[model samples]
Target: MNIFEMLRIDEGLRLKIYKDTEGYYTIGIGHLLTSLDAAKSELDKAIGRNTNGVITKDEAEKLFNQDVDAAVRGILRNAKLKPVYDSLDAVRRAALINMVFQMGETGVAGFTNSLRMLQQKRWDEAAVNLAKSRWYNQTPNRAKRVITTFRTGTWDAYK
Candidate 1:
């Protein structure tokens, strides 16, 4: 599956504002409301008011797409990750984007050894490094699936 389809299932869309697992105020397919002004302004533009805490599917989708682009760009812009990401096939790249989407660029960047393993094309080693992290401990199921994709360079977990 593509990154968009994979992420929609992995993140799970929410039409109304709610606290995510980390207790961040989030809306519209896991988009964190980091800034009230940005969230309010965007919500106002999309659905006439931000007070209702509800968003339409189209608006949610727009946010999802934007978030996805941001993740892709974040991966591409990292000097250490850029060449590694560029070397991956689309399926493997989707796995990385899916990961970056869930964890911000900085969060993913913490996997220094894993990144090095990935750059070396040592998929199993990289997956093992990821599986050893707190991110894996907190979200085991999702981490397993994503790491499996990273290891195998396939979409079997998604399927």
Candidate 2:
């Protein structure tokens, strides 16, 4: 069985999963997670924030890897549900990474137009579409900034 099957994750609580071995796993619900540098980088990319390769110790302390992972899983799950992501490309993965980072899986899943834009390869439109969500309204500048990268495909500015 796959990771999701192993976790027995139904459409219920927001839980996080991590691999302990090949098949075995660890699960946590409402668990606090400390952010790592990598997690920060991914998060910055998700919301279009410029990290400049510098993750503040404080910011790192405030985030959780499981939350990030769940968001990524959400994007993948949503794609699979649509039955159109059987053949995913790098751009799609990158976009999903950003989506999860910005809004978590549940948040990204709510973005119907953004998902459609992603499937259609309307990069700029996708970014703009993402900016129209509540998540974007909550973090306007960051959302616009991240969407810029999604539109341009140049992540060098993040460093």
Candidate 3:
């Protein structure tokens, strides 16, 4: 195994929100953002805030893995994620976390019914509820993919 492979295997490269052992926001190989200052700094450097340069992947996978780690760390640290989130299975868990990735902590938290249904393990219902939002309209194809994965609890074209 080499450097990148080791990070992928050990860190468990993700494409969306994923919490670490201590629950601080991290991504791209353990880039932890545990404080408000760090969050601000990171956000200041991201696309909307910066966008002065271009970017990439492992060529692609690694970059995605990195961003996923960062987004995941950010969400799990949000007070809303742990309890309202950790109860579900991995599939459902990823679905919600991806919402955090797709939107943000505040954004996903607004999905009151959807989160409840997920915690209740009402797969189709939760997926349907998610579809009821403007998030779907932002990206039609991805929304279907997310809902399909949620309803089936099977891996699909997510991420």
Candidate 4:
């Protein structure tokens, strides 16, 4: 599957606002709502009214597609990461995009040693290094899945 499809499964869709695992107010496939105003704006855009606090499938999909694009842009703009990311196949590229999607550019950029390992194509070492983070501890299953993708340079089949 493509990155968006993969992330749709990975992130799951939520039509209404809810606190995420880390307690951020999020909606529409993991888009963080920085403030109630931001949440209202999203709601307004999605459904033309913020009173209902729900979004349509198409609206959610649009937000998700744009979120993916922004994540990719953030990933590519990192000078240190761009070359490393450029060397990967589609599957592995999606892996990086997914990381940036979850953690944001700076968060993933902080993986200095892991980035180097990835740059060198040392899959096992990179996975090991990534697995060492709190991000992995907080979301072990997801982290393992992404690390496996990075390690194998392949897409995983999942429901």
Name the candidate that leads on TM-score.
Answer: 4
Q: List the global CA lDDT of all models.
A: 0.83, 0.48, 0.58, 0.83
- The digit string of per-residue lDDT tens for model 1 on 1-159 reads 688889888889898877777777788887877555566665666555555678888888988988899998988898866877988888888888888898888888878899888878898888889898988998899999999998998889988
Worst 10 residues of 3 by lDDT: 51-60
As for TM-score, the candidate ahead, 1 or 2, is 1
Model 2: per-residue Cα lDDT over 1-159, one tens digit each: 222221122111222333222222222322222234554455455435665434443443233344556655665577542332433354445545554553456656667776677667788888877787775776565565456655765543243
Cα lDDT tens digits for candidate 4, 45-71: 755665466778887887788889899
Which stretches of candidate 1 lie above 4 Å from their native place?
Answer: 35-51
In candidate 2, which residue pairs clash? 48-146, 71-105
Q: Where is model 4 more than 4 Å wrong at Cα? A: 35-38, 41-51, 157-159
Candidate 2 vs candidate 4: the TM-score winner is 4
The window of 10 residues in a row where model 2 has the poorest summed lDDT is 3-12
Q: Residue 88 in model 3: shift from native, Å?
A: 1.4
**What is the alpha-carbon lDDT for the whole of candidate 2?**
0.48
Q: What pairs collide in candidate 1?
A: none
Q: lDDT for model 3, please.
A: 0.58
TM-score of each: 0.89, 0.49, 0.59, 0.90
TM-score, candidate 3, is 0.59
* lDDT for 91 (candidate 2): 42
The residue pairs found clashing in candidate 4 are: none
